[PDB]
Amino acid sequence: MAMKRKKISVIGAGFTGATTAFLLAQKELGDVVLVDIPQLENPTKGKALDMLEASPVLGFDANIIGTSDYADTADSDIVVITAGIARKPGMSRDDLVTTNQKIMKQVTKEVVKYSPNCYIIVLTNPVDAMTYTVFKESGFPKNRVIGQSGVLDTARFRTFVAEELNISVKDVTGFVLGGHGDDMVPLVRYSYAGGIPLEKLIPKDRLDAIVERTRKGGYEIVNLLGNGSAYYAPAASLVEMVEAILKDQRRILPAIAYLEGEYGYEGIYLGVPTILGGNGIEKVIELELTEEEKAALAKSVESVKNVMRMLE
Amino acid sequence: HMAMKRKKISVIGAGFTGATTAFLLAQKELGDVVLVDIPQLENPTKGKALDMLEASPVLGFDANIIGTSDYADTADSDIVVITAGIARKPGMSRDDLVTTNQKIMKQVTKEVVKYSPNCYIIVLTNPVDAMTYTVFKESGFPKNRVIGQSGVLDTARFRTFVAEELNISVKDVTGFVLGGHGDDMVPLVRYSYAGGIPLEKLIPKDRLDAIVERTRKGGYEIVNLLGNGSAYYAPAASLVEMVEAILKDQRRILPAIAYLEGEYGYEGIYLGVPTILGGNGIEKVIELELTEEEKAALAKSVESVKNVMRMLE
Amino acid sequence: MAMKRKKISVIGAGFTGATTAFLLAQKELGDVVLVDIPQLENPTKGKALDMLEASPVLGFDANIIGTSDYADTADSDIVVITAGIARKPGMSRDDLVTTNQKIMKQVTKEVVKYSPNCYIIVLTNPVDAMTYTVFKESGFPKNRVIGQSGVLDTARFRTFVAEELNISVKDVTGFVLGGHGDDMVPLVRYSYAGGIPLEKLIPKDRLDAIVERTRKGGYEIVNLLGNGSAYYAPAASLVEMVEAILKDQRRILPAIAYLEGEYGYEGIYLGVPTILGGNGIEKVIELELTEEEKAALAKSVESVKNVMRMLE
Amino acid sequence: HMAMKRKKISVIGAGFTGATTAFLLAQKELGDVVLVDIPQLENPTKGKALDMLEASPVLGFDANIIGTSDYADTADSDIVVITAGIARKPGMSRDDLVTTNQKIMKQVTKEVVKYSPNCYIIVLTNPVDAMTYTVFKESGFPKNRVIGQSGVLDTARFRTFVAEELNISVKDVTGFVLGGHGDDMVPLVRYSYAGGIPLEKLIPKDRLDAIVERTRKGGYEIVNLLGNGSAYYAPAASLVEMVEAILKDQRRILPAIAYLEGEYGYEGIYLGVPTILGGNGIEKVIELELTEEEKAALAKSVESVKNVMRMLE
Ligand SMILES: NC(=O)c1ccc[n+]([C@@H]2O[C@H](COP(=O)([O-])OP(=O)(O)OC[C@H]3O[C@@H](n4cnc5c(N)ncnc54)[C@H](O)[C@@H]3O)[C@@H](O)[C@H]2O)c1
Ligand SMILES: NC(=O)c1ccc[n+]([C@@H]2O[C@H](COP(=O)([O-])OP(=O)(O)OC[C@H]3O[C@@H](n4cnc5c(N)ncnc54)[C@H](O)[C@@H]3O)[C@@H](O)[C@H]2O)c1
Ligand SMILES: NC(=O)c1ccc[n+]([C@@H]2O[C@H](COP(=O)([O-])OP(=O)(O)OC[C@H]3O[C@@H](n4cnc5c(N)ncnc54)[C@H](O)[C@@H]3O)[C@@H](O)[C@H]2O)c1
Ligand SMILES: NC(=O)c1ccc[n+]([C@@H]2O[C@H](COP(=O)([O-])OP(=O)(O)OC[C@H]3O[C@@H](n4cnc5c(N)ncnc54)[C@H](O)[C@@H]3O)[C@@H](O)[C@H]2O)c1
């Protein structure tokens, strides 16, 4: 009968989790619980308390707590999972999978104990196999277990196109199927500057360079930082997705969704166009792809099946 | 004829406090942001700035952010926020900390005034009373143009503790802390309310004293939890409010570190005092009628500030 | 939808209603149903549609409809009542109270039929007697029936003081108890610029002229417009009250609340300091008033009862 | 030394569109506002202005808002928005509306360009194409400093209908409408998408044709519902996006009414075209590669506009 705040738990209090927590609180999307392992309890509480102390200056009404106790996550409307080791150049794709999978299983189990009705958004890489792992561990219907990937890649692409044409990023669009890197399947033909196909504004070679920079866009921020991974744009990418769900916006967003025949694939998570709203993933949109695009996506899907085969 | 131009804000020092501020500034479309650090940290600075910029299509702000070690990129900044400085390492004395940071302020200020002769400057670097003073003397600028941050942060921690104690919105809680930062700050409970109701009516004294002491220790509370470095979220927010007040000439009444020429009985010092902050920087130091108890607490604060100023070379 | 958007119905689609609806939508507080009499159905649909067609420009996700059918208000979380008649030429004070009483009872019956669990915020003058009418007709708990006057009166006070001192309205606080007009009790003692008592910044004579201009603030706007009363600041005042409830903010705000011993009064609605949150009025706050502040609030309360004796 | 100061926007015509525009600009703190109307309506204009100001403490915005019939109060405006027009009356001919509004545009611009010789001007007043033309010729400003609004509003109505058809956020629908503000406007479905997907892939042809038509009648639909008056919320919203684009030098791509000097094969007229809008007003007309079908729908639109320009005294 009372009007209660949405409750958002963010698991992993490293740069991306914290940046997320702070953005969610500022936008008054609800109360935030920043979670990490017992050994990291003091810094998690320090970050959460520091964020809460900005509330009177920035003028947002939101609780923020830090914790290592998953009992504090009880009755979360949304949980965002950012726990685990980041993508870096020259890393063993298998080692990544092995350590993070274990983390997704231990986290998912504690999340569903205390919030059995929550919607879950996964950042942890590799995001297809880790979102798959939260899906199967959780026992949730596919509309409640969502992965982030395509929004971040479309943000880097739009940024590079906006700088290339010297126009508002507000009026530039991109469009990606599949995951990060080699797995990325962009549709330049469905990318525009104020409604005009980029393919009529930018020579093919310069467009192919922006696409390739988008593929290595993560590695680009790693190379600059020297001793971490991107966090500003990943966190902003999670917040757009959390907002679409909490405010039932019915956004069309690229997301990592479970396929049961869409694009001709079943039993997998894949970056596809999505409607995102109050029921989480409300539709996977099936485009008419050209023979070439179909081919590039069959290629992304074999990489997906390859990483799922590294799962114990 | 003059085309409409974006405001320009340079943030000197691209660690916790400067990067957090820059992102907030960018999200609020207060203008374009130049994030500046030493040559040795040029690339991490470029990474933070580019990561922030790649957030812009998602969060929906129009703002340029670049990282640089070339101060020439700061040219014609309306506002410069100085977070450049060094933390006190175990085995470094008080005196060597003041001196090291002093020397950073002199070198930073020289470059800032060279490329933006008309900018306003806000200083965070600790020890912030002494370092804001160094920036003032080095800049050659009139006092209205050189402002330190500390009060807004300390009132924010105080308003957080009172909001939690009473279970009410932080929006409806008011504090006032003058003096220095850390141990030296002077929270004034007489000028502190919830919905305009004096706090001494709503919270027993023993609890209110613990809230005052907790405010005083607020910095160390966060240092003790993080196990590397100091607070940045609330510090950054406090700088953003002060930047807003100036760029949008809002004439806020808030505590700022202001150069005194007689106010409260003191001259030739930066001290945390009530301020009108607007399009011309510190427009007024407001002189309150203090009690003997407040005056005595303020004078202890001034002794400590003069102690740190004696360590300057 | 598991994450349902909040639903706000605004009864009365004139100046205050329409301006309240457009602010609510812009702030994404929920979906808005704008309601007027069957005769004004089409202008109501056209105001609603016009605001909705601004949603792509201003960037808000919100439905706005106009209707003369209360079934459209079903399961509203909040109902804002602005329904009211403009006092005709050659109509007594008695018949004005009596005409708006009949409108509040008819409106309330429709409101409870379709949203028996809603919070009601009343603006309709005379706002103490009309809030009282909605409470009694509704059978709701007292925390779920609320009136607006204090916030608007504190807003005018704050504007005048901010003009006098040449400072941000953000750093000026006021406190107005009682009713509107001669009935309203501004407490200059509880009034500050940046926490500084206004009696320290403004000579008695200027502070007195500002208290009188706060008393007359409605009249002032009426006399400038020539046809109609204020709507911008009224609407803004209702939005802050709507926001304190939907986001469970627990503001301390002057609101028209039902008294059961507070200030030594019982069985009336009166402007008092209030904690406003997710349960509506969480408590009425009792200040230590001077002998003198007590006399003015008694003068006010006598004026409120005067109007209540006019209720059929 | 110059202190920081607010941007300054004068709104001419304090009716439905002006007042609504004024209240958005202030809430968003885009600058101080001066609401201008005839002397007969000075007190109602001051009443709106004061009502708005009295909301500022509640909605928490720092802006001055004033009402005036004296153009001296508009001195040194960065942006001037012109909404002034005769109130349409039962039985007023088209001649008398256009002819009267032309006179108003010439009188209003004379005063505007006298007190703000360096301002950017956005024109709403109908018939908007011919009226923007009249402000341009009377101002003696370069074409980049005199901009009309019609396409933002008309693409907003299109996006609204497509969003309702598909049940998706308006944030993810794009459209593009060229030409005039009449039945003659050209909504381009080819350059219109939902999440960058072509609308022809998602909406059947009969439905899409009905949306295009509902876009052409958009203004009329609102007139017919209101009974007395035309739309003002979406119009005010459209002016605000165009003011923001200029004040914050955003370099948006939106449809605006621009002086053509060869673009699309037309010379010496104002027409709704794809614009880059920024700190120097209209920075460029973008020439789309239209189909013969589109060229012809635009050619008609141009014919409708030249017909109005014939009636100009
Ligand atoms: N989807 C994308 O596009 C995208 C982009 C950025 C990075 N990422 C992923 O998101 C994260 C970004 O790095 P970050 O800033 O979050 O890293 P970080 O190391 O700074 O923080 C992650 C946290 O996970 C914690 N953690 C480890 N095991 C845990 C467990 N069992 N339970 C709870 N917490 C545990 C770590 O202790 C650490 O604090 C990584 O997981 C990376 O794989 C993906
Ligand atoms: N006033 C307050 O309320 C308050 C609160 C927060 C922190 N602080 C102070 O703010 C300062 C910064 O805090 P932080 O957490 O950001 O520290 P940090 O080490 O994370 O960031 C400081 C940055 O300054 C840079 N820097 C050093 N010398 C420089 C120079 N010559 N030119 C340019 N950049 C230079 C360093 O390279 C570093 O990246 C400290 O002095 C801290 O004590 C004061
Ligand atoms: N409490 C305050 O601070 C405050 C301030 C301003 C306005 N008010 C009051 O607000 C009320 C409305 O103000 P306004 O300026 O919007 O007036 P208005 O005349 O523009 O609008 C009132 C609307 O109520 C409608 N209405 C009448 N009977 C109705 C019914 N049975 N069902 C539904 N709708 C019905 C009318 O048709 C009209 O559209 C008045 O009572 C006014 O005195 C009080
Ligand atoms: N271009 C578009 O997309 C678009 C959309 C909306 C409306 N319009 C046009 O906008 C104009 C304003 O519409 P509205 O709804 O605000 O009308 P309105 O009649 O409510 O307001 C117009 C105001 O202009 C004032 N005015 C008239 N002559 C003046 C003068 N010489 N100097 C100063 N003020 C003067 C009037 O007093 C009146 O208050 C009309 O011409 C309308 O047709 C065009």
Question: What does it look like?
Answer:
Chains A, C: The active site is at residue 180. Chains A, C: NAD(+) 3 binds at residues 15-16, 36, 70, 84-85, 106, 125, 180. Chains A, C: NAD(+) 2 binds at residues 16, 36, 84, 100, 125. Four copies of one chain form a homotetramer. In chain A, 43% of the residues lie in helices and 19% in strands. Chain A has 312 residues and is an alpha/beta fold. Chain A has a domain at 150-310: Alpha-Beta Complex (L-2-Hydroxyisocaproate Dehydrogenase, Chain A, domain 2), CATH 3.90.110. In chain A, strands 3-2-1-4-5-6 form a six-stranded parallel beta sheet, sandwiched between helices. The radius of gyration of chain A is 19 Å and the shape is globular. Chains in contact: A-B, A-C, A-D, B-C, B-D, C-D. At the C-D interface, helix 2, helix 3, helix 6, helix 8 and helix 9 of C face helix 2, helix 3, helix 6, helix 8 and helix 9 of D. The structure holds nicotinamide-adenine-dinucleotide (4 copies). One nicotinamide-adenine-dinucleotide binds at residues 12-18, 36-38, 41, 83-85, 87, 104, 107-108, 124-126, 128, 149-150, 153, 181, 229-232, 235 of chain B.
